[PDB]
Design an enzyme around this catalytic site. Sequence first.
Site, PDB file in Angstrom:
ATOM      1  N   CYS B 152     -36.198  70.740  86.650  1.00  0.00           N
ATOM      2  CA  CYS B 152     -35.006  70.226  87.383  1.00  0.00           C
ATOM      3  C   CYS B 152     -35.224  70.183  88.905  1.00  0.00           C
ATOM      4  O   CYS B 152     -34.770  69.212  89.512  1.00  0.00           O
ATOM      5  CB  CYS B 152     -33.725  70.947  86.965  1.00  0.00           C
ATOM      6  SG  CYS B 152     -33.802  72.742  86.862  1.00  0.00           S
ATOM      7  N   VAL B 156     -34.121  66.902  90.969  1.00  0.00           N
ATOM      8  CA  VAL B 156     -33.111  66.877  92.022  1.00  0.00           C
ATOM      9  C   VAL B 156     -33.670  66.238  93.289  1.00  0.00           C
ATOM     10  O   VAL B 156     -33.007  65.412  93.927  1.00  0.00           O
ATOM     11  CB  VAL B 156     -32.577  68.295  92.286  1.00  0.00           C
ATOM     12  CG1 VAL B 156     -31.738  68.317  93.550  1.00  0.00           C
ATOM     13  CG2 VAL B 156     -31.761  68.778  91.104  1.00  0.00           C
TER      14      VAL B 156
END
Lengths: 476, 522, 522
Positions: B152, B156
Amino acid sequence: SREEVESLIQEVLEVYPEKARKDRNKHLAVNDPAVTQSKKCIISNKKSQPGLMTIRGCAYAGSKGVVWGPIKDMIHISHGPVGCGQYSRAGRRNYYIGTTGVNAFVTMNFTSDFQEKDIVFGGDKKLAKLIDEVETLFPLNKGISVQSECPIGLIGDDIESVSKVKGAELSKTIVPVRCEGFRGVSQSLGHHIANDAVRDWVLGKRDEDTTFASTPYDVAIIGDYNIGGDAWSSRILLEEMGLRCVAQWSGDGSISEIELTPKVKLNLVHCYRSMNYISRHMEEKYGIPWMEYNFFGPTKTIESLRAIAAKFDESIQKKCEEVIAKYKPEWEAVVAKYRPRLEGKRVMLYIGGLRPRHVIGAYEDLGMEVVGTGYEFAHNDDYDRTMKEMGDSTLLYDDVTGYEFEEFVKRIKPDLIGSGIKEKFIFQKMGIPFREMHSWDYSGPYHGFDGFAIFARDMDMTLNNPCWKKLQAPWE
Amino acid sequence: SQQVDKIKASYPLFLDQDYKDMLAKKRDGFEEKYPQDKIDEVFQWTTTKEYQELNFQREALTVNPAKACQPLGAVLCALGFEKTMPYVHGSQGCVAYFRSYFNRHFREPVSCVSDSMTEDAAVFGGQQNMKDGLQNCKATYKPDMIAVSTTCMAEVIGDDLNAFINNSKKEGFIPDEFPVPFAHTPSFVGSHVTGWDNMFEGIARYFTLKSMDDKVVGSNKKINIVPGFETYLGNFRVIKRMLSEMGVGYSLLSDPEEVLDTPADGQFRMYAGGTTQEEMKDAPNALNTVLLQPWHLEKTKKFVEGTWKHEVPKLNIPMGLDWTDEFLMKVSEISGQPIPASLTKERGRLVDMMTDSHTWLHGKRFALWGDPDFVMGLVKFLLELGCEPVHILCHNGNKRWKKAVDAILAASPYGKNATVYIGKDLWHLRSLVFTDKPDFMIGNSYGKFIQRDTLHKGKEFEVPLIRIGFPIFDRHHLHRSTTLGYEGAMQILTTLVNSILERLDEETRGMQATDYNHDLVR
Amino acid sequence: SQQVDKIKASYPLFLDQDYKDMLAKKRDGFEEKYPQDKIDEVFQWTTTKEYQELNFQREALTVNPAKACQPLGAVLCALGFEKTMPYVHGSQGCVAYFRSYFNRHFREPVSCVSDSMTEDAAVFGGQQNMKDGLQNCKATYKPDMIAVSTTCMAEVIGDDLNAFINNSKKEGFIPDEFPVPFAHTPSFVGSHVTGWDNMFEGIARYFTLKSMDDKVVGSNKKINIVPGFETYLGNFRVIKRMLSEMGVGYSLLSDPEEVLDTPADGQFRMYAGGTTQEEMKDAPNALNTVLLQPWHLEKTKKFVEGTWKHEVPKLNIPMGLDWTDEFLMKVSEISGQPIPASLTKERGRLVDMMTDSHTWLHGKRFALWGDPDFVMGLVKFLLELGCEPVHILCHNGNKRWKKAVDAILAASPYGKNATVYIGKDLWHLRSLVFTDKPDFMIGNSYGKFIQRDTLHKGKEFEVPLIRIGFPIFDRHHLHRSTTLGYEGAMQILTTLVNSILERLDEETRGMQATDYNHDLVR
Ligand code: ICS
Ligand code: CLF
Ligand code: CLF
Ligand SMILES: [Fe+3]
Ligand SMILES: [Fe+3]
């Protein structure tokens, strides 16, 4: 001697073409007890080389999974996607007493379950509704911690404000910990941030309260995480001496014990790496002295008990002598039964921080020589302490590569290797007996006189198991 | 105190009188514990229907989920190709957790690396991490392909994997011919099954997109088999065995069974078996592609139909009688090879076992959970057995899957008391089994806690758990089991009927109280 | 009273209040039942060691034996030949009991006939009985062979099977070339395994004794395999599979796989598969004969060595690791074909499983019982696992088997606390498990009552049963299991480890009491 060890180190490093070799040469060293500062030979606390299959963790693991998770009566929210709580859920045996789901929440997984909408637009309002929902569905909780996973620190969510607003609104302590994985290089920074959170949100809620009756025998066990019940064994050993263990955290820990810690007369720190920050802070602010102690092995246990009894009156010293006399026959019998089956065996360890240097005393108490130890996140002081206890001409490693451990073991060829789950089966397929030095291999405790018997039995059951003799087919 | 002859582990050493006294002193002195009557009151409240209504009003809190994140499934998919190294672009704690999870399930070594992106990479990107990590991973582990998934952090920031790999090839960190496929696996979208789908689509794209000019459908007389996220080695083995019994050419894509069941013979084999690159390149020439778990292979289906131009059959997961029968018949239709006598005899033997055990399986109430395709297959099989699935839970399921399962339940009179829940967790299922008590649960190891909770209310309120699914941590070698096909249905039937009989024996073991039913023959 | 929504069977319909009052009134009014305290103290006395000393002094009373009579094994052997009919010369009650026993174990039709000899047949003999029975059986059920065993009734009166069959052939009741082998199976000698041995020796004699003039050893490049009294179809499956993987030609004499595993496809099959008569007449031409269970195949060994002139190898039962290796190596030596890499990989997988499970298996204490070869194989496998057999019971064992097992125990360090009992029944084992408590028991369904017994003394004295052996009545489809070879060792290892883990989970399910050790990962 040292020549062959250095030759093996160079041969292993030869695979790394230009830069990884330079980075990894610093973390591999040969022990010399006369060396005080390990910075002259080994280098630690550095970033890992990419693509080398490291074994280190993240700051979220060191904060939520190590320091804050064992607190039973608090509810810990893994702020972020489902993954990290799921993987960190109940995978660590920080034992406790309580009713799970009512007044205990150690093995439960609380998360905000981030989605794309939460990532794009933020999750502060989601966290607010989170806290109200937690309060309405778990009314017996005594506090909430908010452990931040990666996306939260990346998308610039400000959880301190929502934590303070909710703490004011529902009159309950809420501790925001910014333990994002990208911060730092291992789990050690997770320990530092968790310690700072404890300092700034929990440790000082009874600084103006004097309702607690205090005795001159007040001690606090710091850094004992009750892995299989080690803290319980240590605590029974210390209470048989006459000392009142007022606080015990994180393992089997409540928020009240942390709050009452500033009232004790001594801080017995088990894991220096994970709680030295709070130990020094409590020395500086409240004036509480702290010492390191080692209950892993009868010799080390006796030495630690005598050292602790040294700074109390004569009564405590005589009670320590009586405890030693009481427990002497038991560990003498353990040695008598299990030393002949383990004399002369060679061990190599690669676990973590405190444990790789502290297991040495009981490893030698059974007569087994240790020829190599290493850490994944320890600092220079840990290696400085390691040099004195470790024997000469032994191999030391930091941030070990699986390739490096593989080809080191293929050369040293020890009789037993103690490491984590990620190497258990790798070393099992090689015919080398293995022990999960954290999970205690789903056994334990190994601390105290009571834990020494279990440690000896487990060492025997793995080292002399028949299965290790049947790896080669008779026709091959 | 420890006796040398009989050394006690934590249980029952902490049951000794001195330890009980010490814990009692610790609890009463400094713990500030709530009174035990309050604990009992709150527990009883949590087992009530009003607590269930409050729990099912949850919109922001997830408690005890039943799913994982995408890169785990991506790693599992990458492990199924020959000499392939899973490479996660992001943090190292993610890879540590993936390895720990897969070790605790398979009891095997799992190989996965990370580029170890830090706060610096959060300000300047993870380009240098890509270059250095790819070079090092190629140098020290010597794979034939590095399959790149994301964490992640990397999603992001928005790291361009294509540009990163292309630049790394251009500078000279990896040879230009070295296969480095990639896929974007955001953890905030979907679950691990979505990650498996993304990884397979990425590998297929890298090996087949720019070589479709010379491909002819059916030129090699083979059937592609895409198994999806699978954690039972018996499923791979049974698929291969039944496809070989019919004498049909097959190319099982993403087969990890070899690297997940490596023999222990004094050496460590980091790579073993797997789908060859030649197979992946020749895949468009196959007769057709069959997906065993179509409910999390949506993008793979889209790519195969759009690019390979294969008319993918509309088949359910081959679980139970009817769906295995449909799978075999469709394979026979595609390949032209008839179904042999061995498969018919095995099906008859499964029918015989059903006839033997139906008097015990009838009317039993089950609360089950897991992955969408596995859950729907189990529901179908339970309906064929005469059982009654009451609580069907799928955390990662969607509305379309729920509609499909509801249609399945409507086709049988045994789905009358069935409700399908999507987007719920194990706390919801705890409330459901406290308020609408089933006979058994069927799920992974995480359900064990629920059982404990039920036992706290009373022995009559206990809901025993049957370990079918992923992950199973508290039992050994259950990952060698089978769930697909006639053999998998046989194993499931034996597990279910033996669980029922063991529970019945436990309930009737009391002397002179319930022992009149302790029959020798059942 | 019954509610049509939730109908209750015997349990728990006899637990309601009104039934309890009725039972109490009947007990207090008409039984003249002993006072409860007398019952508790008598039970306590039965659990002591003075009762053990009295129990082990038994000379004439046998309580709950662990064996059957010879004609049962004779029927099992006869069922392993193609279109062969087990005929039992004697009483019909015996055949009814054999059929019910095998029906309850295998859950499959079992075909066996009798001449139904009555009192007049006892006084006058069963010559006319066998004439009529053979004619009727051949006319009605159309077998290609009738294998004749005897009951104790016929064995006491000295019924000459040979003369009766020859007279029946001479008078025209059956064709002269119709094969009717026979064996004398006295129920007051030996046990069911002895009957199996005698039946096989009779069939072999009938087919080979008079035609050994043109037989050359090793002419057909095959190895005969004699399985003996086996009640696990998986054992036949694994033996054939391993022999075919090696490429070794073999003739599995007495193969009852198919007739005990017929499919449910709409028709009933009285006969299925089986060893063919052409395989029996060609048996002496084989390279060598291998006996899987030599400790009850003694007469068969004598006949094979003295007539077929085959130097039978001295191999134990291929169970566990070491004995499976010895069996494979001996078969390779006899046939001249190397052991393939598949079996080496399977052995590696088994060793990997032992390595994984050694922590939970080490030091556990077991009380086991069953047939001689199977019991000794379990003892060997448990010793290889680090487990400690403490009570080894074989009701149908002899002194030589005792010496062999004692030698096996003395070889290992995990046999210092092992005692072997021959001629003892399950009441003796009950006393042993009360006075020297083992962790577990390993046996057939008859052991469940022992477990019940232990649970009446207390939860801490309970000895759980693990169901391996014959007969299994209270569990379904366990006859499908495998005990021989590496697959059998894997199955046994999985069963034992999961039983230990399940017991530990049951012990640690108490909230706030023992749930600190209720670990998700084990
Ligand atoms: S906290 Fe640390 S890795 Fe000091 S993160 Fe780790 S329960 Fe290890 S060597 Mo797991 S610095 Fe504790 C540790 Fe040691 S989780 Fe436990 S065993 S004594
Ligand atoms: S370094 Fe540590 S474990 Fe990694 S994410 Fe970061 S806090 Fe967590 Fe989490 S959902 Fe899955 S496992 Fe990651 S990709 Fe994100
Ligand atoms: S008709 Fe009836 S069941 Fe038959 S023997 Fe006679 S009383 Fe008994 Fe007994 S031991 Fe076996 S089963 Fe027989 S051959 Fe003898
Ligand atoms: Fe394994
Ligand atoms: Fe049947």
